[PDB]
Design an enzyme around this catalytic site. Structure first.
Site, short mmCIF file in Angstrom:
data_model
loop_
_atom_site.label_atom_id
_atom_site.label_comp_id
_atom_site.label_asym_id
_atom_site.label_seq_id
_atom_site.Cartn_x
_atom_site.Cartn_y
_atom_site.Cartn_z
N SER A 83 33.26 38.84 44.79
CA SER A 83 33.77 40.00 44.06
C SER A 83 34.91 40.65 44.81
CB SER A 83 32.66 41.02 43.88
OG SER A 83 31.57 40.43 43.23
N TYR A 100 36.86 46.03 41.42
CA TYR A 100 36.90 46.08 39.96
C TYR A 100 37.07 44.70 39.32
CZ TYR A 100 38.75 50.50 41.83
OH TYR A 100 39.00 51.61 42.59
N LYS A 110 41.74 36.64 40.37
CA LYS A 110 40.81 37.75 40.16
C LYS A 110 40.84 38.14 38.68
CE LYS A 110 41.27 42.30 41.65
NZ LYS A 110 40.85 43.53 42.41
N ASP A 133 42.71 45.54 48.83
CA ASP A 133 41.97 46.68 48.30
C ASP A 133 42.45 48.03 48.85
OD1 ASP A 133 38.85 44.83 47.72
OD2 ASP A 133 40.74 44.91 46.60
N1 LIG Z 1 39.59 34.15 48.65
C1 LIG Z 1 40.49 35.09 48.35
N2 LIG Z 1 41.79 34.85 48.64
C2 LIG Z 1 42.65 35.82 48.34
C3 LIG Z 1 42.27 37.01 47.76
C4 LIG Z 1 40.91 37.19 47.49
C5 LIG Z 1 40.40 38.44 46.91
C6 LIG Z 1 40.94 39.27 45.97
C7 LIG Z 1 42.17 39.15 45.16
C8 LIG Z 1 43.06 40.22 44.98
C9 LIG Z 1 44.20 40.06 44.20
C10 LIG Z 1 44.43 38.85 43.61
F1 LIG Z 1 45.55 38.68 42.85
C11 LIG Z 1 43.58 37.78 43.74
C12 LIG Z 1 42.45 37.94 44.53
N3 LIG Z 1 40.11 40.37 45.79
C13 LIG Z 1 39.08 40.19 46.60
N4 LIG Z 1 39.21 39.03 47.30
C14 LIG Z 1 38.25 38.55 48.32
C15 LIG Z 1 38.23 39.44 49.54
C16 LIG Z 1 37.23 38.91 50.54
N5 LIG Z 1 35.90 38.82 49.93
C17 LIG Z 1 35.89 37.92 48.78
C18 LIG Z 1 36.87 38.38 47.72
N6 LIG Z 1 40.03 36.24 47.80
#
Ligand SMILES: Nc1nccc(-c2c(-c3ccc(F)cc3)ncn2C2CCNCC2)n1
Ligand SMILES: N[C@]1(CO)[C@H]2C[C@@H]3C[C@@H](C[C@H]1C3)C2
Ligand SMILES: [Ca+2]
Ligand SMILES: [Ca+2]
Ligand SMILES: [Ca+2]
Ligand SMILES: [Ca+2]
Ligand SMILES: [Cl-]
Length: 345
Positions: A28, A31, A49, A164
């Site tokens: 996660s 949001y 996401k 975040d």
């Molecule tokens: N594996 C990975 N790689 C890059 C980002 C994330 C990501 C995003 C996110 C944000 C914006 C976007 F455009 C796409 C993804 N939000 C939370 N997370 C991870 C942050 C670490 N715990 C798991 C979720 N996770």
């Protein structure tokens, strides 16, 4: 028109362009929930996401717009930014789902320190990257406010990105005292306190302030940094809170050299400048990047600031459908960055 396909992931249907393949859940996010995927256009690994119920309420709708605007603006190697944004909707009237795409980062900072005794050179690199990212976001008048290892994405080569920022029981162990305790004023250096807490834990392998509640955490903090002066009480609205702090037995500040035994003395000095209760005396991100601890990494030509960021929308109350239309506009106007945006120094 791109052909979309549907796949059930995390117990709900995702609808994504055929460009993105082999979706696999990786947890996660703020949001929304996240899948790793293969971008068949570029051969790169990405994270996608899917925002959860982005227009269900005025709260969701504005935070959807806020997140998309923020991510479209962030263009820094140590800050999560956007490779793509898409929706299966064919028009605003159908628009109800938003997917954000960034480079895949396999881990968070907790994966790095858990089963590995880190070297000082490696700690320097990890903290340097956090600070470089913070200099950039702070320069755009954006504060994280809840910086912690689970909000630091890391790849297989220890390259790190903040996520975040500028936006379930959360850990409070890394939060700045002025934030955790709802003090009346704070500045961008709330995030520097968090860096100090993270850096301390990377050096020792132990959480610096593992408090069981608000008050227990504050007592641990005061044991390290010492009892504050009366001027600190200026910032605290609640009389019962002020009376409580004032009534505490006085504690001297500890010598951090006695707390972080065997650490690089430059690391100890940096920690002393970060872990200060007076947020007006706390070192800034840009100042910390100049600290001798990072001498082998520091490069002023490669520590950029951000383009100005228009946050005037934050003070406005609009209807759900107005935030939705604004968000749709931002989806449609998105310009993907070039695959290669860097050149040899
Ligand atoms: N594996 C990975 N790689 C890059 C980002 C994330 C990501 C995003 C996110 C944000 C914006 C976007 F455009 C796409 C993804 N939000 C939370 N997370 C991870 C942050 C670490 N715990 C798991 C979720 N996770
Ligand atoms: N975490 C520690 C040592 O275990 C606790 C005792 C003291 C003050 C704080 C920070 C350090 C030093 C709490
Ligand atoms: Ca360089
Ligand atoms: Ca290049
Ligand atoms: Ca690279
Ligand atoms: Ca140069
Ligand atoms: Cl802007």
């Amino acid at each position: 028109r791109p052909t979309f396909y549907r796949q059930e992931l995390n117990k709900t249907i995702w609808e994504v362009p055929e460009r993105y393949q082999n979706l696999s859940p990786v947890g996660s996010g703020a949001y929304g929930s996240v899948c790793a995927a293969f971008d068949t256009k570029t051969g790169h690994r990405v994270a996608v996401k899917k925002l959860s119920r982005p227009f269900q309420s005025i709260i969701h709708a504005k935070r959807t717009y806020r997140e998309l605007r923020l991510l479209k603006h962030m263009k820094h190697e140590n800050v999560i930014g956007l490779l793509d944004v898409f929706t299966p909707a064919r028009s605003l009237e159908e628009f109800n789902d938003v997917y954000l795409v960034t480079h895949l980062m396999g881990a968070d900072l907790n994966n790095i320190v858990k089963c590995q005794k880190l070297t000082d050179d490696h700690v320097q690199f990890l903290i340097y990257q956090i600070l470089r990212g913070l200099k950039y976001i702070h320069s755009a008048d954006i504060i994280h406010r809840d910086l912690k290892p689970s909000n630091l994405a890391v790849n297989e080569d220890s390259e790190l990105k903040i996520l975040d920022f500028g936006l379930y029981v959360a850990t409070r162990w890394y939060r700045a005292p002025e934030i955790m305790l709802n003090w009346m004023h704070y500045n961008q250096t709330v995030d520097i306190w968090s860096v100090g807490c993270i850096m301390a834990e990377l050096l020792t392998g132990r959480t610096l302030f593992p408090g069981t509640d608000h008050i227990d955490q504050l007592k641990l903090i005061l044991r390290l940094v010492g009892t504050p002066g009366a001027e600190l009480l200026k910032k605290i609205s609640s009389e019962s809170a002020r009376n409580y702090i004032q009534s505490l037995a006085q504690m001297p500040k500890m010598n951090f050299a006695n707390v972080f035994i065997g650490a690089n003395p430059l690391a100890v000095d940096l920690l002393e400048k970060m872990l200060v209760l007076d947020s007006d005396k706390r070192i800034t991100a840009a100042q910390a990047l100049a600290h001798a601890y990072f001498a082998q990494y520091h490069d002023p030509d490669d520590e950029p600031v951000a383009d100005p960021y228009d946050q005037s929308f934050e003070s406005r109350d609009l209807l759900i459908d107005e935030w939705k239309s604004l968000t749709y506009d931002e989806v449609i106007s998105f310009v993907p960055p070039p695959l290669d945006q860097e050149e040899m120094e």
